Amino acid sequence: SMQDPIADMLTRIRNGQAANKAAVTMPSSKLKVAIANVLKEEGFIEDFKVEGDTKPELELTLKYFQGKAVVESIQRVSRPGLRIYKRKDELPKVMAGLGIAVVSTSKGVMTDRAARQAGLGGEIICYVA
Amino acid sequence: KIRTLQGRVVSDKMEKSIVVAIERFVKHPIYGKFIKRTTKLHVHDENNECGIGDVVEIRECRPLSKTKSWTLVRVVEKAV
Amino acid sequence: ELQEKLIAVNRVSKTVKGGRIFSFTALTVVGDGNGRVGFGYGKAREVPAAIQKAMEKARRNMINVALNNGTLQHPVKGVHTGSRVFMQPASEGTGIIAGGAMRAVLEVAGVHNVLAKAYGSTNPINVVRATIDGLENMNSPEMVAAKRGK
Amino acid sequence: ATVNQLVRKPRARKVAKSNVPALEACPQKRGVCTRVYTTTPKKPNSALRKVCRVRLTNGFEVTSYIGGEGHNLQEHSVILIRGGRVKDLPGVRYHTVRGALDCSGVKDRKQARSKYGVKRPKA
Amino acid sequence: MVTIRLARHGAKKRPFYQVVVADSRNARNGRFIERVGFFNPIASEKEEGTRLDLDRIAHWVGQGATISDRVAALIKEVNKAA
Amino acid sequence: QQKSKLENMFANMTEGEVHEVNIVLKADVQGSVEAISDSLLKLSTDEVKVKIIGSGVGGITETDATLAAASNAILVGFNVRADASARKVIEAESLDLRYYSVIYNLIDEVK
Amino acid sequence: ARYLGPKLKLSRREGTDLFLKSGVRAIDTKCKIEQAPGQHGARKPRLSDYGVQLREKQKVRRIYGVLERQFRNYYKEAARLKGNTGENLLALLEGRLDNVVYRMGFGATRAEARQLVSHKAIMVNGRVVNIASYQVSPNDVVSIREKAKKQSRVKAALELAEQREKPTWLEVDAGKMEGTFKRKPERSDLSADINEHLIVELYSK
RNA sequence: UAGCUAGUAGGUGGGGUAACGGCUCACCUAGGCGACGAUCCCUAGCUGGUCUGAGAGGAUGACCAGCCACACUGGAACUGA
RNA sequence: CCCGCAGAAGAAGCACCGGCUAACUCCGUGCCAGCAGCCGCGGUAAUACGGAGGGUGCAAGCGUUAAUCGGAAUUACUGGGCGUAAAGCGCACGCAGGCGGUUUGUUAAGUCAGAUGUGAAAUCCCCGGGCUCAACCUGGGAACUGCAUCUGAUACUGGCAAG
């Protein structure tokens, strides 16, 4: 169901990257926008966008360099059925630090790199490769 | 004030006694799943105060019976 | 610089109208010592005939694998048919410590450090290619600067 | 598969029952060896082998294989039993010790003296 | 009785005592409150070998603990400032 | 042991004396077991053959009662007492425990 | 805890010069090296992938004259020590007292170097040392004592020691019949033909 | 093994213990525990650790040290901090 | 612990060698006698038995057996399957339980930060020291992944309120 709409968007990317589709449309939210902001910040997606008032729709433009996709893989780590939380140095690094995780800390939604520098962690979302 | 827990009434009238069903969230050591655990504890009461359909604050004390080593202080609202 | 070697040889059977005729197939993997990983299987009625075609086919279909110094850039998962291969970089650690079938592909690629532990099926012909697929899909921190950075 | 299923009932492990019914945390045992029989091997092979029904000190009666060429074992004189399983005469889960207690070692043997209780000859 | 005393944890034919504050009713290597220092009576002529913290024992002396003839002798061997 | 068994030079006895009686003996003193056994072999005859099995140095034991359990035999002692672990075995399975002060009363009953 | 048998059989079975027959002469000439490892050694040199892993360990053990149980500790010590595990293996073996006695040219062979060290004729920093496995560290000076000095065993060794490589990591000296360990030997200064990656592999499984 | 508990659960008063208490009595009320496994059955001292394992875990509880229980079996009291 | 005396003198065995698995021929025996951890050898050329020669591994130890883990991703939380190999209840409605769209305010339980106390010592690990080296012993440090309390952070989950 709509139950887990965070992991929906992670599947929307991988299907869009596999299918070679440019524009991907979906529902919007508070955390839903802030995850996509971190994807553009490091430089994975091309750009994020929102359009609407009563029912805003999250439009994520997908970036492509070669014929192969930009993002290698994106998977839901922490899920409704089982949550994962990481303190300060317990925060795991993906592919020897290459790429970024997405981690929701107290001050805001950050990466595994940025969470180490500030000196505070929280609920990990997903691993961007 | 001394440390407290957020447990609810659960038993109405035990003839000048009151149990407190305490909910809590704990990470399971092996799998890492978060299961709700229920800690039922006997508490001493005064002047037949409010019973079930309420949530009652709790604090440690000298045991006035077998087990029953806690005392109440404050209760949220009235009806369930 | 050719640095070529065989993994294993396995006798097979046909069983025609007359009777059983046995062929031979030798798996081989090759490399230049710094990337350029390649392999070949082939078959023949003799042992020295089959190994020749294996080394001959190993020259073509050769692709670059990106390494930091003498180690992997990161840990990478790779699968082929029914085999499942993991690996960890482990910088200058103990090194080239692994069993046959996957021993050849690592040492000739250039790695003198990374740990294997191949799960699932451990068939000599399926355990190879899971490396080359798992090393091809692996990307380089310098040349991923297209997507990375800006 | 699902985590919430495994929270109710955790993962089960097989007890892995031992292949030595004597057990008692005992490497070797002894037993009375009442009758020494001669029985043919399994389906694939053909031979005549020396095997005896050994009543152990614990109470359990169990058959035991006699290694080496020939033996003086029979009726009385309690023998030691090393154990371990080799499959040939159906039912055998043990081996007798040679050169221990009352049991004689193999005569005129030179290689593999540790096995079969053969002493080093004076040279 | 709270007492400061030397427990032998070293080796056979090579003693290494451990000066420690414990109850007299407890065993030598048994239960104790807490360690203070160490004294090897073998050792050699060198910078280290005898160490003892007078700030810790003098606390326990004030609380009502007695001192054995050896612990006293080791305090009066090393002195305080010397 | 090898000589006595091979001495017959045949797989069995030539006649019907094969029927025999077994005995189990443990005497408190070491001097007797060797001495009286010689006198116990004097009463032996061609018809019925009697043999001693596992002569003991003293008392009684688990492996001794087990020795009489495998092959049916009388368990006798010049002088012996039953151990706590010995009584449990003797009382359970069907056996016979008889101790004799003198060797004469023994030499008569075995016969 | 020593071999005592034929030293050239260890050289033959490996198929490499262990420097056990050195002493007075050198460079073999007469040998029968390799070619018949056993009685049926003239059979083809084809050998398993596992066997060449063990064959490397035996080469290093038969050079330095170390047993598997004593040699198990050097891998365990080299693994726990930092940096490369293979480089630490030969570094701990190179720091043995018998070998440091052999490198300076006191003993004409490696077994003879262990031989002389056993007799309490070698003295580190003044004090005598019996054990050949004594670990030599930086700034340690090692020398022959006054008793049994200038003997034909030690004198002939130091004469022909000049004809060898002459290692840079320790000073030969041989003027007053003494030696000094300058620093820990480099990777380039040892090994070369003997590989550390092959021996380091065997312990992983 | 799905139902298990009459001093059983709680109160009041009295007695009791060095000390709170069904600790032990009288009376009063009908509760208490339990699917988050009560009760019953089988086995077992527990822990720092030991052994194995890349880790997670698994097995284990000699020696060393902490706590507990026991002192031929069963039961009870005295002396004394 | 040190010094002297005499002389190679007083001191090496055990398994194994068909593949797995480092290490081979001959002789004898001929589905006999035996080997064997697994798949298997022997019925007249046995590198698989027995002996011999040779060899390999290891050493005052070497084997067998028993015992636990590893291998075993073969109870798989990390880290597996469920069309045809072992496996989706015959199907459905559903209580407890698990989980839940999206917005604002709030609470600060879960979560995260910092501090304090405790987590005995030993042990393990790291850097040193002392027994001729080592085992052993030992200084300090690290760690003890923990639990509790107190003061903060409010993204996410939960509670509560209005949507």
SS (H, E, C) chain D: CCHHHHHHCCCCCCCCCCCCCCCCCCCCEEECCCEEEEECCCCCCCCCEEEEEEEECCCCEEEEECCCCCCCCECECCEEECCCCCCCCCCCCCEECCCCCCCCCCCCCCCCCCCCCCCCCCC
**In angstroms, what separates the C-alpha of F5 from chain D's closest C-alpha?**
9
- CB of B1 nearer than 7 A to strand H: no
How far apart CA B5 and CA B11 sit, in angstroms, is 17
**In angstroms, what separates the C-alpha of G119 from chain C's closest C-alpha?**
38
Q: Is A2 on the interface with C (CB under 8 A)?
A: no
Q: Closest to C75 (Cβ–Cβ): which among A43, A65, A95? A: A95
CB contact under 8 A, F2 and D72: yes
How far apart CA F80 and CA F100 sit, in angstroms, is 9
Chain H bases closer than 7 angstroms to a protein Cβ: 9-12, 20-23, 28-36, 57-59, 64-67
Q: What Cα–Cα distance (Å) separates residue D5 from each residue in A77, B29, B38?
A: 19, 16, 19
The integer distance in angstroms from the CA atom of B31 to the C1' atom of I145 is 16
The closest of A95, D60, E33 to E19, measured between CA atoms, is: E33
Q: List all residues 6 or more positions away from C21 whose beta carbon is below 8 Å from its beta carbon.
A: C13, C14, C15, C45
CB contact under 8 A, B33 and D10: no
Q: Which nucleotide is nearest to B36 (CA to C1')?
A: H36
Cβ-based contacts of D78 with chain F (< 8 Å): 63, 67
For nucleotide I78, give the residue with the nearest CA to its C1'.
Answer: B31
How far apart CA G53 and CA G61 sit, in angstroms, is 13
Length of chain D: 123
Same domain, A88 and A44: no
Q: Closest to A98 (Cβ–Cβ): which among C137, C141, C150? A: C141
Tell me how many domains chain D contains. 1
How far apart CA B15 and CA B51 sit, in angstroms, is 11
Query: CB of B18 within 8 A of CB of B72?
Result: yes
Q: Which nucleotide is nearest to B63 (CA to C1')?
A: H20
Resolution of the solved structure (Å): 4.6
Q: List all residues 6 or more positions away from F16 whose beta carbon is below 8 Å from its beta carbon.
A: none
Buried b / exposed e across F85-104, counting CB within 10 Å, b at 16+? ebeebbeeeebebebbeeee
Q: Closest to D78 (Cβ–Cβ): which among F2, F5, F63? A: F63
SS3 C91: coil
Same domain, A87 and A64: no
Task: Assign residue A53 the CATH number of its domain.
Answer: 3.30.1370.30
Q: Is A96 on the interface with D (CB under 8 A)?
A: no
What experimental approach yielded this model?
cryo-EM
**In angstroms, what separates the C-alpha of C144 from chain G's closest C-alpha?**
30
Chain D, nearest residue to F51 by Cα: D76
Tell me G72's DSSP state. H
How far apart CA C71 and CA C135 sit, in angstroms, is 12
Task: Assign residue A117 the CATH number of its domain.
Answer: 3.30.1490.10
Amino acid sitting at position C7 = I
Chain B, nearest residue to D4 by Cα: B33
How far apart CA A60 and CA A32 sit, in angstroms, is 11
How far apart CA G16 and CA G19 sit, in angstroms, is 9
For nucleotide I55, give the residue with the nearest CA to its C1'.
Answer: G38
Given A69, A86, A111, the domain boundary residue is A69
Query: CB of D29 within 8 A of CB of D81?
Result: yes
Chains with at least 3 CB pairs less than 8 angstroms from chain G? C
Tokens of D118: 């053969």
DSSP string, A66-82: SSS-S---EEE-SBTTB
Mark whether B and A touch (3+ CB pairs within 8 Å): yes
Q: What angle, 0 to 180 degrees and rounded to 10, lies between the N-to-C axes of helices G110-118 and G152-161?
A: 140
How far apart CA C100 and CA D113 sit, in angstroms, is 37
Question: Would you tell me how many other CB atoms lie within 10 Å of the CB of residue G8?
Answer: 16
Residues forming beta bridges with residue D31, ordered by sequence position:
D56, D79
Chains with at least 3 CB pairs less than 8 angstroms from chain A? B, C, D
How far apart CA G100 and CA G134 sit, in angstroms, is 10
Helix, strand, coil % (nearest 5) of chain B?
0, 45, 55
Query: CB of D116 within 8 A of CB of D68?
Result: yes
Tokens of E22: 């414990």
Cβ-based contacts of D55 with chain F (< 8 Å): 66, 69-70
Alpha-helical runs (H) found in E1-79: 54-63, 69-78
Chain A interface, best mutation among B25, B26, B34, by max A CB count within 10 A? B34
Q: Is C140 on the interface with A (CB under 8 A)?
A: no
Q: List all residues 6 or more positions away from C147 whose beta carbon is below 8 Å from its beta carbon.
A: A43, A44, A63, A65, A70
How far apart CA B22 and CA F35 sit, in angstroms, is 86
φ and ψ of G153, to 5 deg:
-65, -55
Q: Is D7 on the interface with B (CB under 8 A)?
A: yes
Same domain, A83 and A119: yes
**In angstroms, what separates the C-alpha of C19 from chain G's closest C-alpha?**
32
Amino acid sitting at position E1 = M
Cβ-based contacts of A17 with chain C (< 8 Å): none
Q: Which nucleotide is nearest to D95 (CA to C1')?
A: I65
Chain B, nearest residue to D8 by Cα: B35
How far apart CA G125 and CA F73 sit, in angstroms, is 79
The closest of G13, G23, G25, G26 to G111, measured between CA atoms, is: G23
- CB of B66 nearer than 7 A to strand H: yes
Q: Are strands B34-44 and B70-76 parallel, antiparallel or unpaired?
A: parallel
Tokens of D82: 């090393």
Chains with at least 3 CB pairs less than 8 angstroms from chain F? D
Q: Which nucleotide is nearest to D9 (CA to C1')?
A: I75
Task: Assign residue D57 the CATH number of its domain.
Answer: 2.40.50.140
Query: CB of D59 within 8 A of CB of D100?
Result: no
CB contact under 8 A, C148 and A43: yes
Domain of residue D93, residue span: 1-123
Q: List all residues 6 or more positions away from D44 whose beta carbon is below 8 Å from its beta carbon.
A: none
SS3 E9: coil
Question: Would you tell me how many other CB atoms lie within 10 Å of the CB of residue G9?
Answer: 13
Tell me C60's DSSP state. S
CB contact under 8 A, B28 and D6: no
Given A21, A38, A69, the domain boundary residue is A69
Chain D interface, best mutation among A82, A83, A84, by max D CB count within 10 A? A82
Chain I bases closer than 7 angstroms to a protein Cβ: 2-4, 12-16, 20-25, 31-43, 50-60, 62-69, 72-73, 75-77, 80-82, 88, 97-104, 109-114, 120-121, 125-127, 129-134, 136-140, 148-150, 152-157
How far apart CA E34 and CA F88 sit, in angstroms, is 55
Query: CB of G143 within 8 A of CB of G106?
Result: no
Name all domains of chain G by residue range, CATH numbers in brackets: 7-93+190-204 (1.10.1050.10), 94-180 (3.10.290.10)
How far apart CA A23 and CA A7 sit, in angstroms, is 18
- CB of A99 nearer than 7 A to strand I: no
Query: CB of G122 within 8 A of CB of G106?
Result: yes
CB contact under 8 A, A98 and C144: yes
Same domain, A115 and A89: yes
How far apart CA E1 and CA C70 sit, in angstroms, is 66
Question: Would you tell me how many other CB atoms lie within 10 Å of the CB of residue A17?
Answer: 20
- CB of B48 nearer than 7 A to strand H: no
Cβ-based contacts of D1 with chain A (< 8 Å): none
Chain B, nearest residue to A85 by Cα: B32
The closest of G24, G16, G21 to G161, measured between CA atoms, is: G24
For chain C, the distance separating the N- and C-terminal CA atoms, rounded to the nearest angstrom, is: 39
Tokens of G131: 């054990």
Same domain, A9 and A49: yes
Domain of residue A35, residue span: 5-69
Q: What angle, 0 to 180 degrees and rounded to 10, lies between the N-to-C axes of helices E69-78 and E54-63?
A: 140
Alpha-helical runs (H) found in A20-128: 30-42, 112-118
φ and ψ of C56, to 5 deg:
-70, -50
CB contact under 8 A, F53 and D76: yes
The integer distance in angstroms from the CA atom of G53 to the C1' atom of I138 is 40
Q: Is A40 on the interface with C (CB under 8 A)?
A: no
Q: Is B66 on the interface with D (CB under 8 A)?
A: no
